[PDB]
Amino acid sequence: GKKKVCYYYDGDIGNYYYGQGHPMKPHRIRMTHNLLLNYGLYRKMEIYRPHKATAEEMTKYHSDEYIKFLRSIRPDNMSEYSKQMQRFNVGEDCPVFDGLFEFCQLSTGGSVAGAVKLNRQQTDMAVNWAGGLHHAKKSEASGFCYVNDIVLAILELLKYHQRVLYIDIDIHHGDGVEEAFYTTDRVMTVSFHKYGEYYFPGTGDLRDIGAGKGKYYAVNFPMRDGIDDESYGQIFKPIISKVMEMYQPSAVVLQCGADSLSGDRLGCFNLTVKGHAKCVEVVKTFNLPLLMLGGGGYTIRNVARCWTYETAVALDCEIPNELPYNDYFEYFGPDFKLHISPSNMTNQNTPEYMEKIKQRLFENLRMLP
Ligand SMILES: CSc1ccccc1C(=O)NCCCC[C@H](NC(=O)c1cncs1)c1ncc(-c2ccc3ccccc3c2)[nH]1
Ligand SMILES: [Ca+2]
Ligand SMILES: [Ca+2]
Numbered sequence: 001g002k003k004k005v006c007y008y009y010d011g012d013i014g015n016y017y018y019g020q021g022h023p024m025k026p027h028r029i030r031m032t033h034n035l036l037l038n039y040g041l042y043r044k045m046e047i048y049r050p051h052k053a054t055a056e057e058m059t060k061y062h063s064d065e066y067i068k069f070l071r072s073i074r075p076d077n078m079s080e081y082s083k084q085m086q087r088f089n090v091g092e093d094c095p096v097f098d099g100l101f102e103f104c105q106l107s108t109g110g111s112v113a114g115a116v117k118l119n120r121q122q123t124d125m126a127v128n129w130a131g132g133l134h135h136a137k138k139s140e141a142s143g144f145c146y147v148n149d150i151v152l153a154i155l156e157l158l159k160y161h162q163r164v165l166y167i168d169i170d171i172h173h174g175d176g177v178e179e180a181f182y183t184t185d186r187v188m189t190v191s192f193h194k195y196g197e198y199y200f201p202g203t204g205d206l207r208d209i210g211a212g213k214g215k216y217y218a219v220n221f222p223m224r225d226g227i228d229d230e231s232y233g234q235i236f237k238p239i240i241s242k243v244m245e246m247y248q249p250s251a252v253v254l255q256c257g258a259d260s261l262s263g264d265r266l267g268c269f270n271l272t273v274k275g276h277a278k279c280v281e282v283v284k285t286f287n288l289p290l291l292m293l294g295g296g297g298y299t300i301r302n303v304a305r306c307w308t309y310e311t312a313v314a315l316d317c318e319i320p321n322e323l324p325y326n327d328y329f330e331y332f333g334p335d336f337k338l339h340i341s342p343s344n345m346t347n348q349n350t351p352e353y354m355e356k357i358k359q360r361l362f363e364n365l366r367m368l369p
């Protein structure tokens with residue numbers, strides 16, 4: 001029926017600045033919080049402030065060398081660590097900024113706290129919008145991510161769950177999560193993303209299905225520019241339903257990257273908030289312990305709308321399209337509405353392409369015991 005939702009948020013998260021012109025804007029999490037608070041969602045869920053994850057917690061997946069570098073690097077001592085910066089991919093994409101390590105601790109802290117809270121059966125859904133940083137590697141930062149909170153949270157769930165299902169609806173391929181569990185059947189990583197012609201991160205081919213004991217436990221749905229609600233909607237439920245039937249998981253982690261929305265400054269997809277939220281509703285019908293994370297998103301007004309609505313969906317709460325007054329009301333102009341309209345962009349994904357990729361995916365799903 002209606003489930004218990006635990007929400008994680010640190011009031012300071014919005015103060016971390018990546019640098020002038022960088023598209024990663026932590027302020028989008030404070031806009032999200034302010035919007036869902038202003039709609040009255042605080043009355044229906046538990047709000048918790050996440051702890052600052054320790055180097056011990058982070059090293060359950062990451063190397064000590066990489067975590068020690070992260071916990072010591074600063075804009076002032078930058079010149080000293082020139083070699084280490086290159087080794088760990090800290091530079092233009094993943095800059096060195098004031099409070100970098102603290103930001104990682106808060107982002108991670110909520111994901112691991114949600115996994116613990118779910119493990120103890122104290123909640124049915126845990127939400128951490130500051131998490132979902134799917135590109136971070138064992139000893140390397142990548143695509144604005146430094147610590148892979150998702151991998152750490154999955155490692156936490158694996159303590160009480162034999163099989164965990166990871167679903168990634170960000171526009172980019174969830175490389176870091178896929179790589180972490182590429183050779184195990186204990187975690188199945190299913191990712192829907194845009195693919196081809198030097199599009200970040202370069203990975204996510206349909207033919208990438210896992211290795212060793214993890215062969216057939218890595219699923220990838222490569223899409224082209226312009227995918228709409230209708231096209232995405234016809235593939236998501238059938239793939240997820242088959243993955244549930246064959247894989248039979250006991251816990252689910254769903255990364256909700258909003259960079260797959262219409263008009264995103266870094267994305268080329270054309271989903272609306274109702275189309276994006278349809279994925280949360282689909283996953284929610286299986287009534288399995290669920291951890292909901294954030295991820296991509298540069299058009300911060302659309303990110304705030306999307307995650308406010310997906311929190312409402314998780315609560316089975318109907319909220320009006322008319323936006324309530326809030327601390328960032330001017331960002332949502334000139335409509336001041338919660339829902340967004342799709343653009344006139346061409347959907348390169350022909351329905352036949354969608355059905356062909358889906359067919360090949362189901363072939364691979366037949367290979368599970
Ligand atoms: C959407 S924000 C997000 C939030 C949470 C989790 C994930 C994401 C995400 O999708 N991250 C990946 C985004 C793509 C990275 C992509 N980079 C590359 O392709 C390569 C880099 N090095 C070699 S190739 C990129 N797209 C735009 C820029 C960019 C633009 C302006 C900048 C101005 C200042 C400084 C840096 C900047 C980086 N970089
Ligand atoms: Ca994805
Ligand atoms: Ca796997």
Ligand SMILES: [Zn+2]
Nearest residue numbers: 170172259296
């Ligand atoms: Zn992304």
